[PDB]
């Protein structure tokens, strides 16, 4: 029938459970499943020393170090450094076995268990492509991916060129479609459609051909934003149908190739590229081998027809294995569709977006900008106030946007502080964030002690400041102001809630600073003079430099205002430097016949030898000139040199990871050697290549 030739099955196959099980276990060619299996394992091997964190294990998990960590479960803790190296060694071996097909099921488990343990250890390392790797490994554990091109085929005669169940391809194809489609739906947000996210991505040289027929603004809006949205929503349908597969393959290949150079996402683009041929005929690799010379065929996988396999149902009564496989493909695909939209039961992980980042397929939709962070503590006994350096005991900055991470950070601080003579501290946070070029605003209540604050996984957090969505239309006006400013002027846009105030200390270098009111009403107090002045819409007031001032939001609705300032110290210094350069040019061109000043002598000589120490202005000028020369030298570098340096950097990363693992494995098995011996070995492992 027409439907049978289009979808690959018929309505009769869904009539009963037995028919459904029979259809899902239909024998299929394993050539395509094997090629993807090899490619996935090869890329996993490459990724382990680069992004999984093998080359920085000693720095991250240093023994006897004070660090605040963010595990999903508070009871999950890492192992000592030597045992952490063993975990990565087992993960590496499992990936190698998967790529080769040697002891397929054991190798799959060896990769899977260590991978998820490391993933759950750090919530700050979660992203969409790392989440996908764990999903792909989980699926392949139950698949017969070692039936065509693997070592297991040589070890066992029954696993050499054998059929595989159809649900092996259905689950993999369904997973890839979900990644495309859910991403396209998430890209339906107003910010994406209007072109606010990644509004500067069209300046890359890779977009040169488009600019020959479009403007910069038009190219960004149509190509980058609407083009990406269209591909996500139609990539799955294009690949599935064979009348449009050729067009889809070219479009997705171009889409992924560009992304590999526009962003730094590790192996994401290469994994997606490899998954594309999974929609083609399951025997495409075998057909390609058929077009090879007879001599070359002796070094390639078999080309004959696959042999029957017990995993499939042949036109018999299905057994337990077939029924379980049918159940898995239905339940697993159902769970994948639901989870990205489950952010209504776990209400404790929503602050401004939905849930933790990593399992919603929302790539590059929201961009954040942080302006300032302040951490305050008050001693429980003494009662004195103090301030901490933001992110003092952290290895990442993601704690600023999540209430679950902030609660962990505050608990960690209260445990460490007593060792610095602080007893029973109370900690407050003041973080200013802006999302997609909006007004800068607070994200948490600055009057709440987070140590004693209440947090639950299933309850909405009480001390999270709502996002001011009503002020979004101001973005057009904000850009207009920022485009009319002078080359030496800067502006900051702030919105504050009623009943709150902002305390600001203006640096001495920021001469000529002023504040103007855009909406609402505020009161500005000069702390030193104890003077209060009220402001009205469109009113601007000058502020002193090197002093304190406070802004009170007295309106019943949030107020908006902007800061305009100029760095006077830098401006004067640059003018002096420019004047010196003009004088030097006058000397060089033959003018200024008069004797050069003693300070100008170092400029001509370029080396301070046998003379008085040069003034800071001369040193600054020399440093700037040297920096410009280095920049010019870096630009004038042939492509061959650039590629060679790139390969050398990779070689050092791979070599260091191997040597550090050997040292740790030696300690575990034989025993720790003398300190002098250990110091020498670490020095050897830190040597650069070549």
């Amino acid at each position: 029938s027409r439907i049978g030739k289009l979808l690959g099955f018929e309505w009769t196959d869904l009539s009963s459970w037995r028919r459904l099980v029979t259809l899902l276990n239909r024998p299929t060619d394993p050539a395509s499943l094997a090629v993807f299996r090899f490619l996935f394992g090869f890329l996993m091997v490459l990724d382990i020393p680069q992004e999984r964190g093998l080359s920085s294990l000693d720095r991250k998990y240093l023994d006897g170090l004070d660090v605040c960590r963010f595990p999903l479960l508070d009871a999950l803790r890492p192992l000592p450094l030597d045992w952490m190296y063993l975990v990565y060694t087992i993960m590496f071996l499992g990936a190698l076995g998967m790529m080769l097909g040697l002891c397929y099921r054991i190798s799959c488990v060896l990769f899977l268990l260590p991978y998820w343990y490391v993933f759950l250890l750090d919530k700050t390392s979660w992203n969409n492509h790392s989440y996908l790797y764990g999903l792909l490994a989980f699926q392949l554990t139950f698949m017969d991916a070692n039936h065509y091109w693997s070592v297991d085929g040589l070890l066992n005669a029954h696993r050499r060129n054998a059929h595989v169940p159809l649900w092996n391809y259905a689950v993999l194809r369904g997973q890839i479609f979900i990644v495309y489609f859910i991403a396209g739906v998430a890209a339906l947000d107003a910010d994406w459609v209007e072109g606010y996210s990644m509004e500067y991505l069209s300046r890359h040289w890779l977009f040169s051909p488009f600019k020959l027929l479009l403007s910069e603004e038009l190219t960004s809006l149509l190509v980058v934003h609407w083009g990406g949205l269209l591909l996500d929503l139609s990539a799955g349908f294009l690949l599935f149908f064979d009348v449009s597969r050729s067009i889809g393959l070219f479009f997705v290949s171009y889409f992924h190739c560009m992304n590999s150079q526009l962003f730094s996402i590790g192996m994401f683009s290469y994994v997606m590229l490899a998954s594309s041929p999974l929609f083609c005929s399951p025997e495409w690799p075998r057909k390609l081998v058929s077009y090879c010379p007879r001599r070359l065929q002796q070094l390639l996988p078999l080309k004959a027809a696959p042999q029957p396999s017990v995993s499939c149902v042949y036109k018999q009564k299905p057994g337990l294995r077939h029924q379980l496989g049918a159940a898995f493909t239905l339940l697993y695909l159902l769970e994948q569709l639901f989870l990205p939209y489950s952010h209504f039961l776990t209400q404790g992980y929503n602050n401004w977006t939905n849930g933790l980042y990593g399992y919603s397929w929302d790539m590059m939709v929201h961009s954040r900008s942080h302006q300032h962070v302040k951490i305050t503590y008050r001693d429980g006994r003494t009662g004195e106030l103090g301030y901490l350096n933001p992110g003092v005991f952290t290895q990442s900055r993601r704690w600023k946007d999540h209430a679950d991470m902030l609660k962990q950070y505050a608990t960690c601080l209260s445990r460490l502080l007593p060792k610095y003579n602080v007893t029973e501290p109370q900690i407050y946070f003041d973080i200013w964030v802006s999302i997609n070029d909006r007004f800068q605003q607070r994200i948490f209540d600055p009057r709440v002690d987070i140590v004693q604050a209440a947090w639950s996984p299933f309850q909405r957090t009480s001390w999270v400041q709502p996002l001011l969505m009503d002020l979004s239309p101001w973005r057009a006006k904000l850009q207009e102001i920022k485009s009319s400013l002078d080359n030496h002027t800067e502006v900051v846009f702030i919105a504050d809630f009623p009943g709150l105030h902002l305390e600001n200390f203006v640096s001495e270098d920021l001469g000529n600073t002023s504040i103007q009111l855009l909406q609402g009403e505020v009161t500005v107090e000069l702390v030193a003079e104890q003077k209060n002045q009220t402001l009205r819409e469109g009113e601007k007031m000058q502020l002193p430099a090197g002093e304190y001032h406070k802004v009170y939001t007295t309106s019943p609705s949030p107020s908006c205002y902007m800061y305009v300032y100029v760095n006077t110290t830098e401006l004067a210094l640059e003018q002096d430097l420019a004047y010196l350069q003009e004088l030097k040019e006058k000397v060089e061109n033959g003018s200024e016949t008069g004797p050069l000043p003693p300070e100008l002598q170092p400029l001509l000589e370029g080396e301070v030898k046998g003379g008085p120490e040069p003034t800071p202005l001369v040193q600054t000028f020399l440093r700037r000139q040297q920096r410009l020369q280095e920049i010019e030298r870096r630009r004038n570098t042939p492509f061959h040199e650039r590629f060679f340096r790139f390969l050398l950097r990779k070689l050092y990363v791979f070599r260091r990871s191997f040597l550090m693992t050997c040292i740790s494995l030696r300690n575990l098995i034989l025993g720790r050697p003398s300190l002098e011996q250990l110091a020498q070995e670490v020095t050897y492992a830190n040597l650069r290549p070549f």
Binding site: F263, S369, W432, S507, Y565
Partner: peptide, 29 residues
């Protein structure tokens, strides 16, 4: 510098080192 002082803590108009916007999807060294 674990401990700060009043002037540095409240200095809002300071050169932000993390001026560039982040995506949360890009790998960081």
């Amino acid at each position: 510098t674990v401990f700060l002082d009043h002037e540095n803590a409240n200095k809002i108009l300071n050169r932000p080192k993390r001026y560039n916007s982040g995506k949360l999807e890009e790998f960081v060294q």
